[PDB]
Structure 1
Amino acid sequence: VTLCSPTEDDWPGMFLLAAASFTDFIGPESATAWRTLVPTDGAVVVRDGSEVVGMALYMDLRLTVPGEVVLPTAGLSFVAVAPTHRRRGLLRAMCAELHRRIADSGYPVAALHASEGGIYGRFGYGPATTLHELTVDRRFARFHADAPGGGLGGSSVRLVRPTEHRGEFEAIYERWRQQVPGGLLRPQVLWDELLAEAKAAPGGDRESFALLHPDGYALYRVDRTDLKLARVSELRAVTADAHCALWRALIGLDSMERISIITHPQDPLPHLLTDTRLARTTWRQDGLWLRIMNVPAALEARGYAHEVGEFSTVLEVSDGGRFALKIGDGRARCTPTDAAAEIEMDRDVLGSLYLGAHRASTLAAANRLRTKDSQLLRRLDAAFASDVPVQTAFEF
Structure 2
Amino acid sequence: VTLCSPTEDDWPGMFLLAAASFTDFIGPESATAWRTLVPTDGAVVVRDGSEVVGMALYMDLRLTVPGEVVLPTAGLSFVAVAPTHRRRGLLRAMCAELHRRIADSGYPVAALHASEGGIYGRFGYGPATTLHELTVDRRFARFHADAPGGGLGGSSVRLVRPTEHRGEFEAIYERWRQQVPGGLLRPQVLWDELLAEAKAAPGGDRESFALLHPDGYALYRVDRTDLKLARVSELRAVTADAHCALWRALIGLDSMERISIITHPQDPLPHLLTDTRLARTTWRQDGLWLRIMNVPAALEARGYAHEVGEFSTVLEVSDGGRFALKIGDGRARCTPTDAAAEIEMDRDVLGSLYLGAHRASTLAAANRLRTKDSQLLRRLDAAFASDVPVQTAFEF
| Most deviating of 383-392 and 18-27 | 18-27
Q: Percent identity?
A: 100
How far has the Cα of 1:26 moved from its partner? 2.9
1:221-269 Cα offsets, whole Å, 9 max, x none, are 0000000000000000000000000000000000000000000000000
Distance in 1 of aligned mates of 2:295 and 2:366: 22
CA distance in 1, matches of 2:123, 2:208: 38
SS of match in other structure, 1:40: coil
- Deviations 1:122-160 (Å, cap 9, x if unpaired)? 000000000000000000000000000000000000000
Deviations 1:372-395 (A, max 9, x none): 000000000000000100000000
Aligned residue for 1:135? Answer: 135
In 1, the alpha carbon distance for the partners of 2:379 and 2:342 equals 13
Per the TM alignment, residue 87 of structure 1 is displaced from its structure 2 partner at its CA by: 0.3
**Superposition CA RMSD, Å:** 0.3
Cα distance, 1:28 vs structure 2: 1.3
Q: Which runs of 5+ in 2 are unaligned?
A: none
Q: Distance in 2 between matches of 1:24 and 1:194?
A: 15
Write the distance in 2 (CA, Å) between the matches of 1:122 and 1:375.
Answer: 29
2 CA distance for matches of 1:9 and 1:274?
Answer: 60
Q: TM-score, normalised by structure 2?
A: 1.00
User: CA deviation digits over 1:244-302, x for unaligned, max 9?
Assistant: 00000000000000000000000000000000000000000000000000000000000
Corresponding residue of 1:103? 103
1:317 aligns with 2:317: yes
Note the alpha carbon deviations across 1:185-235, whole angstroms, 9 max, x for none. Answer: 011111111100110100000000000000000000000000000000000
Q: Distance in 2 between matches of 1:25 and 1:341?
A: 45
1:310-346 deviation line (CA, Å, top 9, x unaligned): 0000000000000000000000000000000000000
Number of residue equivalences: 396
Deviation, structure 1 residue 27: 1.9
Q: How far did residue 25 of structure 1 move?
A: 1.2
C-alpha distance in structure 2 between counterparts of 1:182 and 1:112, whole Å: 12
CA distance in 2, matches of 1:49, 1:167: 49
Deviations 1:150-193 (A, max 9, x none): 00000000000000000000000000000000000011111111
In 2: Cα distance, 1:395 partner to 1:107 partner: 20
1:85 match: secondary structure: coil
- In the alignment, the residues of structure 2 paired with residue 68 and residue 288 of structure 1 have an alpha-carbon distance, to the nearest angstrom, of 17
Q: Take 1:85 and 1:18, find their aligned partners in 2: how far apart are those partners?
A: 14
Q: Larger deviation: 26-35 or 100-109?
A: 26-35
Q: Secondary structure at 2:170's aligned position in 1?
A: helix
**Aligned partners of 2:310, 2:200: CA distance in 1, in Å?**
56
Matched residue, 1:355: 355
Report how far residue 24 of structure 1 moved.
Answer: 1.1
What whole-Å deviation, never above 9, does each CA across 1:91-148 have from its counterpart, x for those lacking one?
Answer: 0000000000000000000000000000000000000000000000000000000000
CA distance in 2, matches of 1:162, 1:176: 18
Residue 187 of structure 2 corresponds to residue 187 of structure 1: yes
TM-score, normalisation: structure 1: 1.00
C-alpha distance in 2 between matches for 1:32 and 1:288: 23
* CA distance in structure 2 between the aligned counterparts of 1:262 and 1:26, rounded to whole angstroms: 20
- Partner Cα distance (1:250, 1:137) in 2: 11
Moved runs in structure 1, 4+ residues, more than 6 A? none
